Structure formats: structure tokens, C-alpha cells
Curated annotation (Swiss-Prot), chains A, C:
Remaining remarks: The conserved amphipathic domains in ShlA and HpmA may be responsible for pore formation.
Source superkingdom: Bacteria
Disulfide bond annotation, renumbered to this chain: none
Identification of the protein by name: Hemolysin
Compartments, as annotated in UniProt: Cell outer membrane
Function as written in the Swiss-Prot or TrEMBL entry: Bacterial hemolysins are exotoxins that attack blood cell membranes and cause cell rupture by mechanisms not clearly defined.
Full-sequence range covered: 30 to 234 of 1577
Curated annotation (Swiss-Prot), chains B, D:
Gene that produces this protein: hpmA
Protein name according to UniProt: Hemolysin
Cell compartment(s), UniProt: Cell outer membrane
Other known facts: The conserved amphipathic domains in ShlA and HpmA may be responsible for pore formation.
Role according to the record: Bacterial hemolysins are exotoxins that attack blood cell membranes and cause cell rupture by mechanisms not clearly defined. Cell-bound hemolysin, which releases heme-iron from erythrocytes by interaction with the erythrocyte membrane. HpmA requires HpmB function.
Domain of life: Bacteria
UniProt lineage: Bacteria, Pseudomonadati, Pseudomonadota, Gammaproteobacteria, Enterobacterales
Length: 205, 204, 205, 204
């Protein structure tokens, strides 16, 4: 597979373990602590998905015992940014776990995101963004839902996390339960800072 | 801010220092449901207090209050506030249940805007852009059928304790929601009393 | 059983169902909506306990299908006040459910209360009070932990409720997790209003 | 209010408008732990901001702040604040993690009083009347051994989001605690990093 990486230098190494759980060896973080991963497909099944942010080996909740992520050069990531660069929407039907050092995680898919029983484990702050990240000179500047009418949909089995949660999309539909420490929810066509302060809004004339 | 309906489902509404409004909710039925009907239901920064007390005491937002004389040996377990006009609701401050803790539901099919609103001493709070469904005087559930109106969460967000239900044809948001668990249901649907979805109206 | 009622007019009828779950037919509520029940023992085992606050028959979570409480004269209780009047401390090892109309529940035991895996179901507000209720002319005036050094202890399996929670005791020990919508915790020797506003405190000279 | 230790575990502390203090936490180790040591750690009504940012941005309590220059390509995932003097802590306002969200732990074996304190943008907050345990420079856990001091929650209570740990020989309280889940451990114990209890010291 449900997660297929991009072919460039921003494509992480993706593999699968045992019962279908996918393990993502995220790319090296940059000088701003951002592991910027790009995908042609980012879908999570019921077996879930594990982002390897570990410097030493250990045991993950979803995938059992895993080794360190060799793409990390002695530094864990602070923000794991997952960006779909194709036209395919994301379907999240299981848990995403940050293995190793806890970090923030962001899924960016301007084509749409569906959460039906998804969740986050060992992430300090988790964000679902139906929109694109904005870069200038390689520094992350924020996000944009401008000129976009796609949907963040929360299905019957809902979304759970013990940490912080951001839901960012032109439109949000829901028919289930959200469990999170706190939820920042922002609808409409806007631009955002990296922390999801609203900077601008696109309104019809 | 809060204007009751003229019928016998209209509660008595007064104000105390600061502008905080106090609502002596109507007598509940045997099942604990106090069904209150309003021409307007808007909460300002000074907030609003539902008097669900069988003894005098101290409310957090309005100071000392007497028992609610509409209560006859039983407090509400569900305080259902229904707007029966076409006026949308604006909630800019806290809603407090004074006395016995209870569930609070605001039902306004015209739309609800929360901007810095919240709930004190409720065991469950619900914002419903829709109507309650009654049958032989018994609350059967809620309906967002044949309704395109908006539940809007503003920049100062929504803070509550415990269970929160956001029920509306459409939900817009521009800020933070704090609750232990949020049941969010968009679209045109019917629901049970406890907001289990029972049916959905879908375009053909 | 663990729950044995007092012999007076304030003793509720207590029975047991199937796997040991105890069903309490609480006494008639008074003009202030208070069902005042007195016990020689109030202990909850793993099978839990159900307070019957129902006007029509139905199904409870812990005890299956139950009938209405005939002690209710067409009015459910608003506050279920359970008071131990003996010297025996309370051990709560399972859930307490209010069957029927949701109400507030208070357990008052000046001898001590231990919660180890206890919880509350369909209670709007739940209170554990190592102390005594104060009455004047039959109206509940509040509670007192004065001249009392006994313990509210929370054990390894903790306490859970989706509603509001008050923990009132001379001293509180804990070695577990509390899950509640909100917790008011008050230690020391004090008196309280019915809503647990502190009115006075006993301090050594 | 907040006075850092003179060693290299002492962070830089400044103040902005209103009196809000800003803490440029020390460089974390590879495991994300920023170990900060203080002669005093008290938060006033204006609150306190931990700068855990790798880019400039907007903090909620202190306005615009630059990146924390102590951070070298990795933000803290755990901000451990340790008082190494005998001064007890008084927390009368909010503690904000600005930048990357993180866990926050205040360790003060002399005692901690919370009265209107709270936490913004933390994924877990912990008050520990005790000491962290280190081994080869790695955080192994925490200890309330040989300690009789008090964690005291005052009338204005404690508000946080998500997970809260209250770890102290004794806990007194006089108000409301808001959190999704509270791990409360009294007595004299050792704990893992994640506050699993590992041993207990008991009278003979």
C-alpha cells in the first residue's frame, strides 16, 4: 504494498514484515530536522505501518524486532514528512507507528485522505493534510490547501492517538469517533505556517 | 442572548452580574429529559448557567443561586435545548450545568457557531445542526435530514470535558477542539438518543 | 455478598445475578432527589455492581436484563448516595453501573476506600469520599473528612470512567492510572458543600 | 523565576513582554533527551516557553521567536528539567513547548506546587518529586527513594492535554486536574523512563 516510494533521492526504502505490516526506512533528516519522504502511493492496511526512526535496534509494537535505520547518520528525525506526489488518494485503515525516537509525523496528500480505523503510536504530534507542503530554499515554510476541493474523510472505525492531532483539508466528512489529546481542525482553502497557524485564505469573489 | 419560547417548554431566563444568563430549565419528564425550546439561543463571553439544582448552592459562573423551582424532586439527566425559530446560534462563552451534573444538547437546525465556547459540569455535550425526534412525548433520537446548514468552529475553538458530539450536515473549523472523545457525523442522517447513526439520506 | 445493606429504612434491597454481579435496588429518592442508602459493607468484586435506577425494564451492561426498581415511585433518583455506617473499609475491584436513568453516585466510607480496577458506567458524576455526609433537617449539606486520617488508595488496575470524578479523602495513595473526564481531588481534613467546594479546614495548632 | 545551573546543562533563560520566560534548552543527545539543570524552576502567571524550534516561528505565549541555536539538526523529544539545588518549585502558569512537540518532565526532589499550572504542545507531561537516574549518560528512569517531599496541587488546579504523570512521595490536592489519563504513583519507588514502577522502598 500500500505504501510505494518515489524513485528520487526523497524515496524511502519500504519493506514488509510477517502479517503484512510495512516498515519504512525514512530518508536522512535535513538541517531543520525534517525527514522529507515522497511517495507514489501511501495507503495503510489493517496490519499498519512503521516508520523506522531508531538509532539502536529494538522491538516495535506493530512489526516486532527491528534494526536501526541506516539512513540516519547518527541523528533521529524530528519531523517525519510523508508527501504523496502522485494523483492517488490515501486510505489509512490501520496504525502508523514511529519506531525508535518519538517524532512528529505529517501525511500530505492533496488528492484526499480517508481514515477508517487509523491511528498513531509514539508520535508527539500527528497531522493529516489534504494539501501540499510549501518549501522555499529547502526550508519548510508551511502548507497549502489552496485551489483544492478534496476531502479528508473519517470512517466508521475512526481515528485514535494518545498525542496531538491536526486535521487540515478543504473539506472534512466524518461518521465516527476521534480520540486524541487535542485536535486542531482547519477547513477551507488556506495557507498555513509549519505549526498550522492560518496565514491566508482563498475566498470566491 | 437566550430568548425562551412562549409555550410551556419555554424556561425562565434571567441575568446576573457580568451579563451571565441563568436558565431555569423546564421540569424534566420521568426519564430525566428537560426539553427546552427557544426563539434564540446564543451564549456571550459571560457564559450561561443551567439551573439543575434541587438545593441552593454556588455556581461557578453566576455565583450563589437558589434551587430551580421547576424541578419537582428530580433533576434533569439530559438538558435538551431546541431552537424552534430560524435564528442560528452563536456560542462565544461557557455553558455551565449548576447543581446535578447532566448531559447537554443544543439542537438548532439553522446552524451553530462555536467560537470560544465550552461546557462545565456536563457528562456529555452535543451540538446538533438538526432536530430532535419525539414519539409519544419520548425522545427517540435526532435528525439532520433535509438540511444543508453548518456547524462552524471558530478560531477560539471548543473546550469540554469527556464526550463531545458534533452532528451537522457540514462541519467547518478554524481552531482547536478539546474533549476526551469526539463523535463527529456529517451529512444528512438520523440518530438514536446516544448518536448511533440509524439511516442516511444520500443523493441519487 | 460484598455489599450488605443496613437494617433500617435506609437499607436498599441487594441481590446477585449469574456470575456474582450484585444488583442494588436503591431506596426511594427524597424531595431533594437523593437516594440515601446505608450499608454495613460496601465492596465491589470483579463481577461489578449495578444500581437499579430504572422506571422501565431493560438490559444492563453488567447484569443483563433487569426490571424496574419498584422502590422508585415514578421518579428516578438524581443523586445515589451510598454511605457505609459500620467500621468496615470499602474495596472496589470492579465496575459500578447506574442502570436506567443516569444519575450522580457518591460512595461515603470514613473508614477507607480502595480502588483497584474500579470504575463507573452511566454515572454523570462519581465521587469517592473517605468521610461522612452532613445532614441538617434531612437536607444534604455536604461532607466532612474532619478528625479522620484514613486512606483513599488507588491500586495497580486503576480507576476508569467516561464522566466526572471526585476523590475526597484525608490522604490519597496511588500506584496506577486514573481515566476520567475531569478529576476534583481534595486531600486533608476539611468540610465540603454538596458539590465539593471546600468550606473549612482542620489544622493542627 | 527560572534560574539555570552554571554547568553546561544550564540553558539560556530570557524574558519577553508580560514577563513570560523563554528557555533555550540545551542540545539534546542522540536519543532526543535535552537534560536541563536549574538552581530554580518556578513558573509565574506569565508562563514559560521552551524553545524546541529548528526554524523561527510564532509561540503562543511569547510571540515571535527565532530557532534555538543550541539545536543542531535535531529537536528534543524529551525535555527533562531537573532542579539540582534545594529550592522547591512553584508552577503558577503555563509551560509551552514552542517548535517541535515533545514530552516535558520537571524533576524537583525538594517538592513541586502546581496552582493553575499547565502544558501546551506537549505529548506527555510529568511532575516528579524525585530525581532522574542516569547510567553512562543515558536516562534510565526516576527515583523517589529516600524522599518525603510533597507534590501539591493548589486551588486553580492543573490542566494538560493527553498523558500526565504525578510522581511523588506524597500528593496533596485542592482542586481540579484535567488530562486524558493520569498515572499517579505515591511513596518511595524507582521507575523506568516511561514511569513503569520497578521497585518500592517500604518501612520494616
Amino acid at each position: 504494498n500500500g505504501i510505494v516510494p518515489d524513485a528520487g533521492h526523497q524515496g524511502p526504502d519500504v519493506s514488509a514484515v510477517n502479517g503484512g505490516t510495512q516498515v519504512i526506512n525514512i530518508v536522512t533528516p535535513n538541517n531543520e530536522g525534517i525527514s522529507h519522504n515522497q511517495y507514489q502511493d501511501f495507503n495503510v492496511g489493517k496490519p499498519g505501518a512503521v516508520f523506522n526512526n531508531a538509532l539502536e535496534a529494538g522491538q516495535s509494537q506493530l512489526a516486532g524486532h527491528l534494526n536501526a535505520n541506516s539512513n540516519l547518520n547518527g541523528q533521529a528525525a524530528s519531523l517525519i514528512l510523508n508527501e504523496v506526489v502522485s494523483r492517488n488518494p490515501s486510505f489509512l485503515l490501520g496504525q502508523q507507528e514511529v519506531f525508535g525516537i518519538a517524532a512528529e509525523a505529517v501525511l500530505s496528500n492533496p488528492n484526499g485522505i480517508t481514515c477508517d480505523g487509523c491511528g498513531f503510536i509514539n508520535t508527539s504530534r500527528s497531522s493529516l493534510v489534504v494539501g501540499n507542503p510549501l518549501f522555499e530554499n529547502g526550508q519548510l515554510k508551511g502548507y497549502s490547501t489552496l485551489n483544492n476541493t478534496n476531502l479528508l474523510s473519517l470512517g466508521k472505525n475512526g481515528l485514535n492517538t494518545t498525542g496531538l492531532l491536526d486535521l487540515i483539508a478543504p473539506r472534512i466528512d466524518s461518521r465516527g469517533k476521534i480520540t486524541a489529546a487535542e485536535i486542531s481542525a482547519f477547513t477551507g482553502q488556506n495557507t498555513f505556517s509549519q505549526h498550522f497557524d492560518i496565514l491566508s485564505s482563498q475566498k470566491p469573489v
